[PDB]
Amino acid sequence: IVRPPFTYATLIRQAIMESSDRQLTLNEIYSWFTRTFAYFRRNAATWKNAVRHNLSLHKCFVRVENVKGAVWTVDEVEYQKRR
Amino acid sequence: IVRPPFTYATLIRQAIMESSDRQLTLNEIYSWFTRTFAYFRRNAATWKNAVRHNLSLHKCFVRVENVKGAVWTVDEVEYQKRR
Amino acid sequence: VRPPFTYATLIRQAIMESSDRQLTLNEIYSWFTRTFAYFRRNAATWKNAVRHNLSLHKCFVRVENVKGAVWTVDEVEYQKR
Amino acid sequence: PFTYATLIRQAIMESSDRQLTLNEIYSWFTRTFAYFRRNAATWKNAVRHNLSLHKCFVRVENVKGAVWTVDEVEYQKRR
Amino acid sequence: VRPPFTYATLIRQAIMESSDRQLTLNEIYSWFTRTFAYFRRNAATWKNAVRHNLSLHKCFVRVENVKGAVWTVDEVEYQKRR
Amino acid sequence: PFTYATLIRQAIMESSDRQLTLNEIYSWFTRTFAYFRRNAATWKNAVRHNLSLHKCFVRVENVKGAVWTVDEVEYQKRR
DNA sequence: AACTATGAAACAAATTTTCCT
DNA sequence: TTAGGAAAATTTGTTTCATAG
DNA sequence: AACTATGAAACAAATTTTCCT
DNA sequence: TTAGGAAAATTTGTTTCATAG
Ligand SMILES: [Mg+2]
Ligand SMILES: [Mg+2]
Ligand SMILES: [Mg+2]
Ligand SMILES: [Mg+2]
Ligand SMILES: [Mg+2]
Ligand SMILES: [Mg+2]
């Protein structure tokens, strides 16, 4: 098994960008990771922690609260900075 | 953390070829893996199983019993076949 | 062509492979339970497994004759295991 | 009991010229797996029937309970 | 060159940060124990950590002037952490 | 209480011009870590001494046990 | 080809915040 | 009104990776 | 650029074998 | 001499990866 050659930030952005409304709940993001790569079908304690850490740490990922909870979105302009 | 871009057989051969007498016990091979790459400092249940599996499966790795137990060696001619 | 297996050949196998060369009905049932469970696989599964075994085990050698390709068994390399 | 290796050997071993193409091995496995699928729900009664029908299977009653044995001479007479 | 810390400023910090602005001697000791344990780090450790924090937190802005580059604190940006 | 951020901020805030080069921050941390290393075995007695020496620290005896408080007015004079 | 130095990423954790029994 | 638990977030400090010199 | 087919590798496990309490 | 335990080996069958076509 090989981990994808992309950063967590890039992968998370990919997940969100591929969604129909450009937004995903945390659990939906986890699902995208496990469905897409074999690497994420094990050691969940490690990679899910990485995902949450990246979502909070990086300003390009903005939590948008809504009636049923909250979804994560991507501030593309922000994502582009430093990259 | 990234796993080395080499097969288990290639890494095992490397460990043995670097030893002073071209022989290593199983525990010494585990130690070479952990000392050499961060990747092998976690999920021991998985990679140690991989190492034992590779040692038995591939004919290029020959167990040589000795007074103190047994060491693993490499049949270079064999390793070269299929490669 | 003779069937690969029959209840008779299977019952004989169960008994012959046993310790005392004897089995109670319940023991024969246990053996059959395990055996039928093993075969409850699909073509996609066994087909993959067959190719895997032919290219992994040395006892299986492919002899190319005036037909295309045929696999044979090296009994001497088969016994060692 | 069975492994793909023993099965592949059985197929090849039980064929004249002791050879088989990959397609022929596939055919043998198809027949074999079909057999077990077809009889997955009948083997219990089939076994009881065979035990009492064929003389090669002899019931030996010992201390506690009874056991079944094979009369190899009788068995080898069927073929 | 007044010291960055003195027992006096530390004792006051422990008491001021407390719930009811008052601590027993033992509570002050517990605070000091934790504090001294935090600082038991080597130069290789804190040096790395300092560079890490300067380039991670936006409240720390490098204002490049005349010669060399000096940092500074964005009191407002630091407000979030407050 | 303390994080590298609060410390870096403390250093810069206590400096003139409220600015510091990376080397100056390094100097401040060197002095700071040196302080805690130097006094790792003396702080218990040092704390007891300071509490009874400085009037800004007042011992208030309530129901069970006694607690220490800071007389903010007194503390500020000396600064 | 080695080796060092170093920021971005990755990691491992300790805490916090919310929503529910 | 608290007490806990699980998710979800937020934070901190350390280790690893990729590479410019 | 996509997609399929497929052998090598990688995985996950069930068992075995040895050496010691 | 039987009963585990753990490390070391051996085995089997399934999933993943890289890539020819
Ligand atoms: Mg964010
Ligand atoms: Mg071997
Ligand atoms: Mg082979
Ligand atoms: Mg009969
Ligand atoms: Mg920053
Ligand atoms: Mg006093």
Coordinates of C-alpha atoms and ligand atoms in Angstrom, one line a residue, chain F residues 50-59 68, ligand 6:
Chain F
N50 CA 9.7 35.9 49.2
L51 CA 6.2 35.3 50.7
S52 CA 7.4 36.4 54.1
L53 CA 9.8 39.1 52.9
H54 CA 7.5 41.1 50.5
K55 CA 4.5 42.9 52.0
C56 CA 2.7 42.6 48.6
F57 CA 2.1 38.9 49.4
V58 CA -0.5 38.7 52.2
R59 CA -1.5 35.5 53.9
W68 CA -1.8 33.7 49.9
Ligands
MG6 MG 4.4 39.0 53.0

